[PDB]
Write a protein that holds these residues in place. Structure first.
Motif, PDB file in Angstrom:
ATOM      1  N   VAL A   1      45.848  22.566  63.557  1.00 33.15           N
ATOM      2  CA  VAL A   1      46.822  23.353  62.816  1.00 33.15           C
ATOM      3  C   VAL A   1      46.142  23.821  61.541  1.00 33.15           C
ATOM      4  O   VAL A   1      45.784  23.000  60.687  1.00 33.15           O
ATOM      5  CB  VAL A   1      48.088  22.544  62.495  1.00 33.15           C
ATOM      6  CG1 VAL A   1      49.090  23.401  61.744  1.00 33.15           C
ATOM      7  CG2 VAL A   1      48.700  21.977  63.765  1.00 33.15           C
ATOM      8  N   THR A   2      45.948  25.130  61.420  1.00 38.18           N
ATOM      9  CA  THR A   2      45.321  25.730  60.245  1.00 38.18           C
ATOM     10  C   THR A   2      46.429  26.286  59.361  1.00 38.18           C
ATOM     11  O   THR A   2      46.999  27.338  59.654  1.00 38.18           O
ATOM     12  CB  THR A   2      44.329  26.817  60.645  1.00 38.18           C
ATOM     13  OG1 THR A   2      43.450  26.316  61.659  1.00 38.18           O
ATOM     14  CG2 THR A   2      43.510  27.258  59.441  1.00 38.18           C
ATOM     15  N   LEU A   3      46.757  25.555  58.302  1.00 41.50           N
ATOM     16  CA  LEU A   3      47.727  26.016  57.323  1.00 41.50           C
ATOM     17  C   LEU A   3      47.093  27.076  56.435  1.00 41.50           C
ATOM     18  O   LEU A   3      45.996  26.880  55.896  1.00 41.50           O
ATOM     19  CB  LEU A   3      48.227  24.844  56.483  1.00 41.50           C
ATOM     20  CG  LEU A   3      48.754  23.663  57.293  1.00 41.50           C
ATOM     21  CD1 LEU A   3      49.199  22.548  56.369  1.00 41.50           C
ATOM     22  CD2 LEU A   3      49.895  24.105  58.196  1.00 41.50           C
ATOM     23  N   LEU A   4      47.794  28.197  56.291  1.00 44.27           N
ATOM     24  CA  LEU A   4      47.341  29.349  55.528  1.00 44.27           C
ATOM     25  C   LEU A   4      48.440  29.743  54.556  1.00 44.27           C
ATOM     26  O   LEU A   4      49.575  29.995  54.974  1.00 44.27           O
ATOM     27  CB  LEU A   4      47.017  30.525  56.455  1.00 44.27           C
ATOM     28  CG  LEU A   4      45.899  30.338  57.482  1.00 44.27           C
ATOM     29  CD1 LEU A   4      45.826  31.539  58.408  1.00 44.27           C
ATOM     30  CD2 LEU A   4      44.571  30.120  56.793  1.00 44.27           C
ATOM     31  N   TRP A   5      48.111  29.793  53.266  1.00 42.96           N
ATOM     32  CA  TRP A   5      49.054  30.234  52.250  1.00 42.96           C
ATOM     33  C   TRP A   5      48.368  31.247  51.345  1.00 42.96           C
ATOM     34  O   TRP A   5      47.206  31.606  51.546  1.00 42.96           O
ATOM     35  CB  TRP A   5      49.609  29.062  51.428  1.00 42.96           C
ATOM     36  CG  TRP A   5      48.570  28.146  50.870  1.00 42.96           C
ATOM     37  CD1 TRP A   5      48.116  28.112  49.584  1.00 42.96           C
ATOM     38  CD2 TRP A   5      47.870  27.111  51.571  1.00 42.96           C
ATOM     39  NE1 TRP A   5      47.168  27.129  49.443  1.00 42.96           N
ATOM     40  CE2 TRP A   5      47.000  26.498  50.648  1.00 42.96           C
ATOM     41  CE3 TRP A   5      47.890  26.648  52.890  1.00 42.96           C
ATOM     42  CZ2 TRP A   5      46.156  25.449  51.002  1.00 42.96           C
ATOM     43  CZ3 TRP A   5      47.053  25.605  53.238  1.00 42.96           C
ATOM     44  CH2 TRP A   5      46.198  25.017  52.298  1.00 42.96           C
ATOM     45  N   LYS A   6      49.104  31.713  50.346  1.00 40.56           N
ATOM     46  CA  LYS A   6      48.610  32.712  49.417  1.00 40.56           C
ATOM     47  C   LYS A   6      48.482  32.136  48.015  1.00 40.56           C
ATOM     48  O   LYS A   6      49.173  31.175  47.658  1.00 40.56           O
ATOM     49  CB  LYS A   6      49.540  33.932  49.373  1.00 40.56           C
ATOM     50  CG  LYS A   6      49.305  34.947  50.477  1.00 40.56           C
ATOM     51  CD  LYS A   6      50.001  34.537  51.759  1.00 40.56           C
ATOM     52  CE  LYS A   6      51.507  34.667  51.606  1.00 40.56           C
ATOM     53  NZ  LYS A   6      52.229  34.404  52.876  1.00 40.56           N
ATOM     54  N   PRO A   7      47.595  32.694  47.192  1.00 38.17           N
ATOM     55  CA  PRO A   7      47.556  32.299  45.781  1.00 38.17           C
ATOM     56  C   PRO A   7      48.854  32.670  45.082  1.00 38.17           C
ATOM     57  O   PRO A   7      49.524  33.641  45.441  1.00 38.17           O
ATOM     58  CB  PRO A   7      46.369  33.090  45.219  1.00 38.17           C
ATOM     59  CG  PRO A   7      45.547  33.457  46.413  1.00 38.17           C
ATOM     60  CD  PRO A   7      46.524  33.645  47.530  1.00 38.17           C
ATOM     61  N   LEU A   8      49.208  31.882  44.075  1.00 35.54           N
ATOM     62  CA  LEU A   8      50.464  32.066  43.365  1.00 35.54           C
ATOM     63  C   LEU A   8      50.283  33.015  42.189  1.00 35.54           C
ATOM     64  O   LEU A   8      49.297  32.935  41.450  1.00 35.54           O
ATOM     65  CB  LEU A   8      51.005  30.721  42.879  1.00 35.54           C
ATOM     66  CG  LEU A   8      51.624  29.850  43.972  1.00 35.54           C
ATOM     67  CD1 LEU A   8      52.010  28.492  43.416  1.00 35.54           C
ATOM     68  CD2 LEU A   8      52.830  30.542  44.588  1.00 35.54           C
ATOM     69  N   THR A   9      51.242  33.922  42.028  1.00 38.74           N
ATOM     70  CA  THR A   9      51.212  34.885  40.944  1.00 38.74           C
ATOM     71  C   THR A   9      51.532  34.210  39.615  1.00 38.74           C
ATOM     72  O   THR A   9      52.009  33.074  39.562  1.00 38.74           O
ATOM     73  CB  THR A   9      52.209  36.016  41.195  1.00 38.74           C
ATOM     74  OG1 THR A   9      52.116  36.981  40.139  1.00 38.74           O
ATOM     75  CG2 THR A   9      53.626  35.468  41.250  1.00 38.74           C
ATOM     76  N   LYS A  10      51.266  34.937  38.528  1.00 39.80           N
ATOM     77  CA  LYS A  10      51.559  34.419  37.199  1.00 39.80           C
ATOM     78  C   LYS A  10      53.043  34.143  37.002  1.00 39.80           C
ATOM     79  O   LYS A  10      53.406  33.382  36.101  1.00 39.80           O
ATOM     80  CB  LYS A  10      51.062  35.393  36.132  1.00 39.80           C
ATOM     81  CG  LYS A  10      49.577  35.279  35.843  1.00 39.80           C
ATOM     82  CD  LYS A  10      49.202  36.053  34.592  1.00 39.80           C
ATOM     83  CE  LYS A  10      47.714  35.946  34.301  1.00 39.80           C
ATOM     84  NZ  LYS A  10      47.344  36.674  33.056  1.00 39.80           N
ATOM     85  N   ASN A  11      53.911  34.756  37.810  1.00 46.68           N
ATOM     86  CA  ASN A  11      55.320  34.383  37.784  1.00 46.68           C
ATOM     87  C   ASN A  11      55.514  32.954  38.272  1.00 46.68           C
ATOM     88  O   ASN A  11      56.328  32.204  37.719  1.00 46.68           O
ATOM     89  CB  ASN A  11      56.136  35.358  38.632  1.00 46.68           C
ATOM     90  CG  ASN A  11      55.986  36.794  38.174  1.00 46.68           C
ATOM     91  OD1 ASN A  11      55.412  37.625  38.878  1.00 46.68           O
ATOM     92  ND2 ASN A  11      56.502  37.095  36.989  1.00 46.68           N
ATOM     93  N   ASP A  12      54.772  32.557  39.304  1.00 44.96           N
ATOM     94  CA  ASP A  12      54.854  31.215  39.867  1.00 44.96           C
ATOM     95  C   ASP A  12      53.749  30.295  39.368  1.00 44.96           C
ATOM     96  O   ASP A  12      54.028  29.169  38.946  1.00 44.96           O
ATOM     97  CB  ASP A  12      54.804  31.281  41.396  1.00 44.96           C
ATOM     98  CG  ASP A  12      55.982  32.027  41.982  1.00 44.96           C
ATOM     99  OD1 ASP A  12      57.049  32.057  41.335  1.00 44.96           O
ATOM    100  OD2 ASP A  12      55.843  32.586  43.091  1.00 44.96           O
ATOM    101  N   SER A  13      52.497  30.754  39.405  1.00 41.40           N
ATOM    102  CA  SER A  13      51.367  29.974  38.917  1.00 41.40           C
ATOM    103  C   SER A  13      51.333  29.867  37.403  1.00 41.40           C
ATOM    104  O   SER A  13      50.453  29.179  36.873  1.00 41.40           O
ATOM    105  CB  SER A  13      50.057  30.587  39.411  1.00 41.40           C
ATOM    106  OG  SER A  13      49.735  31.756  38.676  1.00 41.40           O
ATOM    107  N   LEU A  14      52.260  30.527  36.706  1.00 36.49           N
ATOM    108  CA  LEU A  14      52.237  30.628  35.253  1.00 36.49           C
ATOM    109  C   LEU A  14      50.904  31.194  34.789  1.00 36.49           C
ATOM    110  O   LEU A  14      50.649  32.393  34.934  1.00 36.49           O
ATOM    111  CB  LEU A  14      52.506  29.272  34.597  1.00 36.49           C
ATOM    112  CG  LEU A  14      53.904  28.694  34.813  1.00 36.49           C
ATOM    113  CD1 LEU A  14      54.023  27.336  34.148  1.00 36.49           C
ATOM    114  CD2 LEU A  14      54.965  29.647  34.288  1.00 36.49           C
TER     115      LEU A  14
END
Lengths: 198, 87
Positions: A29-42
């Motif tokens: 199982v290859t989990l793939l997500w995205k980097p978080l924006t400054k709205n979320d990643s601060l």
């Protein structure tokens, strides 16, 4: 000077890629997500921590660093996974939990599915849902060129909507296979698969 | 600032006249996702037919009205609009 003022708000949105034969109980199982924006990643995110959950091994957390991909071997009948975005002050507060369960993978939620080429880079997807007994979080649409190995891309669709607009540089000469995956608390549901051009 | 428009169009409303037809046949063909050809054959008119008005909307919708005036001396028209393929 930009420093992380607080803990991240929400965790990244992630999906799975299946590797291995269907006859194999154990599969990659290859989990793939995205980097978080400054709205979320601060301001900045220092790492992603993948906390597992199993009926046998319990809950164990795995750090993937800055990588947005992580491949793990799934063997147990039920396996929950959560992703937390850790910054200089803490982890992401709201985090999605996704469960893998082979019997639950046979549960369908979409009655009808259709795709329409709004433009070369705009496609509208419509769906009508069955009346769900299990707890449905959202949907996951997977689109790829029909009869191809790689190149597939996925999007998380809120379960409250019936239409979704996908804007990607699709290949007009290639027919695309759209796979909408119903995501439940008990686990991933049985997808609805259609074929259509763009 | 100097006056009113010289040539103006007059539109009358009359319920009995709303019961009088002039179009024999009407058909539409989607030339493209935005261009559609509308063809029509008109009946021999007894009342003076000034022009035609084509109204297009999403089917089974209250709103979404889009109208265009067509000269009465033509038989085919090109309707250009951001047409919705599903509807």
């Amino acid at each position: 000077l930009v420093m992380d003022v607080k803990v991240p708000m929400r965790g990244p949105e992630f999906w799975r890629k299946m590797d291995g034969d269907v006859t194999k109980k154990e599969r990659n199982v290859t989990l793939l997500w995205k980097p978080l924006t400054k709205n979320d990643s601060l301001c900045s995110v220092r790492r992603y921590v993948v906390k597992h959950r199993t009926a046998h091994n319990g809950t164990w957390s795995e750090d993937v660093g800055n990588r947005t991909n992580l491949t793990f071997l799934w063997t147990e009948p039920a396996h929950t996974v959560t992703v937390l975005a850790v910054n200089s002050l803490g982890a992401s507060l709201v985090n999605f939990n996704l469960t893998f369960s082979w019997p639950m993978s046979k549960v369908s939620a979409v009655e009808s599915l259709s795709a329409y080429p709004l433009s070369s880079s705009c496609v509208i997807l419509s769906w009508t849902l069955s009346p769900d007994d299990y707890s449905l979080l959202y949907l996951v649409i997977e689109w790829k060129i029909l009869n191809e190995d790689d190149g597939m891309k996925w999007l998380r669709i809120p379960s409250n909507v019936k239409k979704f607009y996908i804007h990607d540089n699709f290949i007009p000469i290639e027919k695309y296979q759209f796979s909408l995956y119903p995501v439940f608390m008990e686990g991933v549901g049985k997808p609805k698969i259609i074929n259509g051009f763009t």
